[PDB]
Write an enzyme that holds these catalytic residues in place. Structure first.
Site, mmCIF file in Angstrom:
data_model
loop_
_atom_site.group_PDB
_atom_site.id
_atom_site.type_symbol
_atom_site.label_atom_id
_atom_site.label_comp_id
_atom_site.label_asym_id
_atom_site.label_seq_id
_atom_site.Cartn_x
_atom_site.Cartn_y
_atom_site.Cartn_z
ATOM 1 N N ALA D 80 54.416 50.942 38.914
ATOM 2 C CA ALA D 80 54.637 50.364 40.254
ATOM 3 C C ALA D 80 54.588 51.477 41.294
ATOM 4 O O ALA D 80 55.196 52.532 41.074
ATOM 5 C CB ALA D 80 55.956 49.644 40.296
ATOM 6 N N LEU D 90 49.041 58.037 43.981
ATOM 7 C CA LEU D 90 50.361 58.098 43.303
ATOM 8 C C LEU D 90 50.243 57.588 41.857
ATOM 9 O O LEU D 90 50.861 58.183 40.969
ATOM 10 C CB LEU D 90 51.366 57.282 44.118
ATOM 11 C CG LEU D 90 52.556 58.071 44.664
ATOM 12 C CD1 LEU D 90 52.096 59.239 45.520
ATOM 13 C CD2 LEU D 90 53.500 57.165 45.448
ATOM 14 N N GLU D 116 45.915 43.531 36.791
ATOM 15 C CA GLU D 116 44.532 43.211 37.271
ATOM 16 C C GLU D 116 43.479 43.842 36.352
ATOM 17 O O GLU D 116 43.756 44.900 35.795
ATOM 18 C CB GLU D 116 44.221 43.711 38.683
ATOM 19 C CG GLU D 116 45.262 43.414 39.747
ATOM 20 C CD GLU D 116 45.189 44.381 40.929
ATOM 21 O OE1 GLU D 116 46.222 44.564 41.610
ATOM 22 O OE2 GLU D 116 44.098 44.973 41.164
ATOM 23 N N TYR D 120 42.421 49.721 35.364
ATOM 24 C CA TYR D 120 42.794 50.605 34.218
ATOM 25 C C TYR D 120 41.553 51.166 33.488
ATOM 26 O O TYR D 120 41.694 52.179 32.780
ATOM 27 C CB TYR D 120 43.844 49.906 33.337
ATOM 28 C CG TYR D 120 45.231 49.887 33.948
ATOM 29 C CD1 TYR D 120 45.901 51.088 34.181
ATOM 30 C CD2 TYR D 120 45.856 48.701 34.345
ATOM 31 C CE1 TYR D 120 47.146 51.128 34.789
ATOM 32 C CE2 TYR D 120 47.113 48.720 34.940
ATOM 33 C CZ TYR D 120 47.748 49.940 35.168
ATOM 34 O OH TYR D 120 48.972 50.031 35.755
ATOM 35 N N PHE D 396 54.051 43.309 27.239
ATOM 36 C CA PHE D 396 55.041 44.302 27.710
ATOM 37 C C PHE D 396 54.476 44.936 28.982
ATOM 38 O O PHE D 396 55.197 45.655 29.648
ATOM 39 C CB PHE D 396 55.341 45.301 26.595
ATOM 40 C CG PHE D 396 54.135 46.092 26.168
ATOM 41 C CD1 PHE D 396 53.773 47.248 26.848
ATOM 42 C CD2 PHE D 396 53.337 45.658 25.123
ATOM 43 C CE1 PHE D 396 52.641 47.961 26.482
ATOM 44 C CE2 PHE D 396 52.206 46.371 24.764
ATOM 45 C CZ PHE D 396 51.858 47.520 25.442
#
Ligand SMILES: C[C@@H]1CCc2c(sc3nc(SC[C@@H]4CCCN(C)C4)nc(N)c23)C1
Ligand SMILES: C[C@@H]1CCc2c(sc3nc(SC[C@@H]4CCCN(C)C4)nc(N)c23)C1
Ligand SMILES: C[C@@H]1CCc2c(sc3nc(SC[C@@H]4CCCN(C)C4)nc(N)c23)C1
Ligand SMILES: C[C@@H]1CCc2c(sc3nc(SC[C@@H]4CCCN(C)C4)nc(N)c23)C1
Ligand code: NA
Ligand code: NA
Ligand code: NA
Ligand code: NA
Lengths: 396, 396, 396, 396
Positions: D80, D90, D116, D120, D396
């Site tokens: 997050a 970040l 989304e 990744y 998870f």
């Protein structure tokens, strides 16, 4: 896979089956209320070797039939077969056993509310009341000049919290159910349950209000998700005046767009408006189902139309007897016979005719009911007709 | 702002108003068909100084009433007031003039189909038939054992192009309309129109097919946008056998999920299925509206239930007369009187009672109909009852 | 109720049944095209006494199977039983007769497109291709760096009217169908039909455009009602380059929000985007169904994976033979035997395995396919696998 | 804007970011459960001067890969970046640091569930399992004759409260996860969480029931808003018999219209029904994502298809090494080399291939994977294939 009356140990098993079978199930706290209405030996369970894989029971009810005659009625309820034990004839066997007991106990009729419209015909149950949803667009609703209670001066209707006027609701409903075919005695514990559902539930239903008249009441709540919709849970009126007064009050809910109510086909509300069409019928369904347990006992108990002359016939019920039926003076005498049958029907068909909801002409046309004589058909239509329109009390 | 019978020059003006007033309007090519059903002096127009700003007419129709009695009927139609001339009492004035003419011409009744449910009550029209939409989920539909025409051997129903069997459709409809309350003679030009709508229209409706029986027919088409929906435009059956046979054939449309039909409340189709509930009532509305033009003429023309004994009363119609009404042997004698009235109603209320669609009990309860004697109410209910259920023929 | 080959007189009857049975039916003008693909004695009709109440036929097709091997294929089509003649075993009898003829004519396989997913299993048909709808939200679509044809300089894709480039479409499709399992030879008359549907229809479908590459083409049209949706009717690409180029061009439809295409599970399009997930699978269904008419002929015709070592077994097909099956070098020898069966399956199951769309592991797990040896299961999985992914050509 | 391991003081800040970042967040009470699965130095936070504006961690997991081989797996989670600190690189910096630590700690793979489908890929993660929603219309569902456990006699499936049978669920899931690619060890605290969600929540989810078999279980609940829908949260079956038995039990939920389940593409359920098509695929999505942290360690750990002969090649992973890869006997030896590469791919592509969910043919066709030799492509397809179909354990 044995069939028994449940013991105290079997109940937790039944409440588990209940929770998984019925999505309106409330829980043990509340099933202990209804349990008071089940007589000793009113329940069967099917164990497998042991978990309850099947259950059925009846409740002791009082059904009002045409002629303001009140009958003891086995109310079939809480019927469930585990998804693990379908197509095992488990319903057939439970229904067969409860029917033995109901009949031996001396109930003339049994009744139920059908989760599906195709299960219960084959066990002798006939759809005998008709549910009718009316949705009123109340922004356009103007009462006709002919409508009662539209002179100036104070209203006789009050807005009240339901819980502070239990006594008056009990009184009105008691008068109502005694004078309307389909009427059921509502015992203390079912009033307990009705008023527990009056209160707003956290992320559930909203507060229920009450419009109270000396001879009528209406419980209503705003819909959870549609905030322009008022849902009338229940409106009981003993006088036409009370019925009009309450509807004047409901059309008065000015922050609502639509009033919704489950009522009966002969509800006079459309005739109270200058535009009949504003009271749109949005949904229709079979209400109460009857199995006539004893044909002579039941035909003899109810009143018949005085406006049809005296007449006689022979009625056969497929595997339920053959009878000399004689009707005049709104009484029927029903006695055994081996005389040739003039009219034939399965026992479910009699159930449907019994409260005057369905015309014998209509069932004859489907060949659910056989006669060669169309004069006899007209005479049955007329006799079985209910002068007071048949209504549905509460679901069980 | 003058009121006249139209001249040949006024018609183009009327067709313009028609196109802008009615969204189902077809066009001059097709309005010339219907025009044959308007008698000389059957039309009024309102000119402004000149463009047609208002029009109304009636058509010469034949309505079948209880007792298989056929009445000449003024069919009110093509009523329209320009949006430029609302709230000008233009309808009031046109309706007043056509009512003078219909009455002087010697029509005992007028009828119409109401675009809205609140306009026509005040001109003496009562909703007198009930439209009932049934939607069948035909994937679950199993016919009851009791159902006719379920033995092996050939079907007596054929799939056919409508246009190649006009003769048989005319024959069946002719038998039908003569024997059913609500029945209308369908003239050559309306058959012309019905079969022009049978054919698929470019980016319109799809081809219409026909199931034909010796004593019945069904026209049906697949819905424009929902291709799992078959819409039954029209099903006419003279025998219960024909009715069942045709429904067997419709449940047979295996590529459809749902059969849709506008029918009447006493349609026996739910009783033909093992599950009554598969025939869901999806929509309900007032069908044909009647204005009783002459109270004695009309009450005397129709048959009444033989099953109610002979009885007498005094009926007052608000501003439409007071009459000694005597009913027995399914005949009524209706004669002037100044004797005290026992029952009162506006003239629209009589319209509703006249085909047996609405019970006098039901209208009494709304106070649309007044009497002190509830025995007389039971006797009217019984007498005005129609043994053959009332149906709606075609919209006009 | 007799079963015959139709005469010229029977065809109008069949076109009537067709119009009432199929909602995508086009009409006699266009059924005369497809009729050229039906061989003499390729059609059966069922007359009642006479109207056609049942029909079935096959078309002469060429199906490409693994190993770029092309088989003569009976394409079952135009199968219909009148709604008047359901549950009469009329399909059973028509399918039985066409299967006699197809088999005697020397077709090794038959194929069909199933209107419902539960009719055709019992006649020996197995779902053998998988349809996959991908809907791309093209506003977010960015091609991966790894994607071909994203260097500067001119595009090799052109926007063109379909009708002006029939020749190039025929050429590309011809290359495609010869090299892809599921490929069908598309005859002149089906190109005629494809390009007649390219043109905008009055209140129907909108104009169809074409993106043309030297080794690929895409036909697409904007949806009738949703004007932000482009529906890709057909995309044929011989090279990975052609496939990417065309998708670059489709993502380029900047006035669209969504590109829609019916494709196969191994379509590489999601791997061309930086976000795999933008290519959402919106719908999945059985495509082509196969009935293996001759087990040895068919098992011997197709190629098998070279990457599985040589191995032998005994396959039983329920009521379709028992065979010594030996597979190595991507060839199979299949010969009669009475040796104990090692693997068993109904004939529909073989149909599903035959183009490599379904894994024998998957069908074994459902017990549609029986063996005691899970090594033999792994060896069938591997052998029947299709190196080139199986696709669906056109529906018939 | 510094990057550190969090201190006890940083956690409240992280739970605030969590609540605002994730809409499925449960709260500190429940985040203290999951926290046990984070190892010391398994978390990074980004402070601004101090409020937490960024966080990421991994959990110690055990992933089962082809060959029933269980790998220590860094499960990336709780990632997050505050909406106040977007497009600040970040994520890039947090992912870079956790990847240093995971790699140094000696995890061969990392895995995640992607909020989304486009974030990744660029960090070396490949979609490696496929989620498949099946919705069954259970009113039409008939099991095939070939289906197991359809003989008379008692069922081996029980309806039970989940909480009273934790032990049996743990036992079955333990057997399951050890034998299925995609399987994860489920620790005590995640069972604690699973069974806390079993219970009905005030104006939340409804009670969850359990169908329990000796070698299988299914948890299911009725949908909050759609009361004809049963949502199967989780079905684990070790034997094909257990899988069929449980589905027999679910089709048995007679008060439901639809059963819904998130499963895998090779789920055999459609092959158990006479109509494959009743099990419609309603939704598809990437499940588990893998980053191969150490290419040789990982390629060497998993089993490969025995049915492909021995073969050798040189694999290059863009910025992740070049290796002599030799595969035979379902083992792989993977050693450094500077020999010319024969096949190339980014590291995310290897992730996708690694559990056999995606074919190298399919990724090659998108040019995500480069080789000149299509025989080597066939050999990779075959070798990386998983005999037992790959599934997704828990999110998870
Ligand atoms: C042992 C007693 C018997 C009946 C009983 C309970 S709880 C309860 N709640 C209800 S609520 C009414 C709906 C309407 C339609 C059918 N559904 C089942 C419920 N009803 C019962 N009969 C009962 C326990
Ligand atoms: C002069 C004649 C009079 C009636 C007439 C036409 S066209 C036409 N089409 C129709 S179609 C039926 C719908 C049903 C409800 C009411 N709508 C008006 C129409 N009807 C007419 N009466 C007519 C011209
Ligand atoms: C005698 C010939 C045989 C087949 C045939 C026609 S028209 C026609 N149109 C079509 S259009 C394709 C759809 C796809 C799925 C199944 N539907 C039936 C149609 N197809 C035919 N086989 C035919 C007449
Ligand atoms: C410090 C621990 C780390 C992970 C963790 C919590 S709470 C919690 N709840 C959940 S619930 C599962 C969904 C599925 C998709 C991704 N979402 C984030 C959640 N998951 C965690 N990893 C966690 C606190
Ligand atoms: Na009712
Ligand atoms: Na009607
Ligand atoms: Na396909
Ligand atoms: Na999965």
């Amino acid at each position: 896979v044995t069939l028994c009356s449940p013991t105290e140990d079997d109940w937790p098993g039944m409440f588990l089956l209940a929770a998984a079978s019925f999505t309106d199930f409330i829980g043990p706290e509340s099933a202990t209320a209804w349990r008071t209405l089940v007589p000793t030996d009113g329940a069967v369970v099917v164990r497998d070797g042991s978990e309850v894989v099947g259950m059925a029971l009846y409740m002791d009810l009082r059904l009002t039939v045409p002629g303001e005659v009140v009958l003891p009625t086995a109310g079939l309820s809480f019927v469930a077969v585990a998804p693990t034990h379908r197509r095992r004839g488990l319903l057939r066997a439970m229904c067969a056993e409860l029917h033995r007991r109901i009949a031996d106990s001396g109930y003339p009729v049994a009744a139920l509310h059908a989760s599906e419209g195709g299960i219960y015909g084959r066990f002798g149950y006939g759809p005998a009341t008709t549910l009718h949803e009316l949705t009123v667009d109340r922004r356009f609703a103007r009462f006709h000049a002919d409508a009662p209670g539209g002179g100036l001066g104070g209203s006789s209707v009050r807005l009240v919290r339901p819980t502070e006027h239990r006594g008056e609701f009990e009184a009105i409903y008691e008068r109502w159910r005694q004078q309307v075919p389909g009427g059921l005695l509502r015992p203390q514990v079912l009033w307990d349950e009705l008023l527990a559902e009056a209160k707003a539930a956290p992320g559930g239903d909203r507060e229920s209000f009450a419009l109270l008249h000396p001879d009528g009441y209406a419980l209503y709540r705003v819909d959870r998700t549609d905030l322009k919709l008022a849902r009338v849970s229940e409106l009981r009126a003993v006088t036409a005046d009370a019925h009009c007064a309450l509807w004047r009050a409901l059309i008065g809910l000015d922050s609502m767009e639509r009033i919704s109510i489950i009522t009966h086909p002969q509800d006079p509300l459309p005739h109270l408006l200058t535009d009949t069409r504003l009271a749109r019928t949005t949904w229709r369904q079979d209400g109460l189902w009857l199995r006539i347990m004893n044909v002579p006992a039941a035909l003899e108990a109810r009143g018949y139309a005085h406006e049809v002359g005296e007449f006689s016939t022979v009625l056969e019920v497929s595997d339920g007897g053959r009878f000399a039926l004689k009707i005049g003076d709104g009484r029927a005498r029903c006695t055994p016979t081996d005389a040739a049958a003039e009219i034939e029907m399965d026992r479910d068909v009699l159930g449907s005719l019994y409260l005057g909801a369905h015309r014998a002409s209509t069932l004859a046309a489907a060949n659910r009911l056989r006669t060669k004589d169309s004069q006899l058909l007209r005479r049955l239509d007329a006799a079985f007709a209910s002068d007071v329109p048949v209504q549905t009390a509460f679901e069980f």
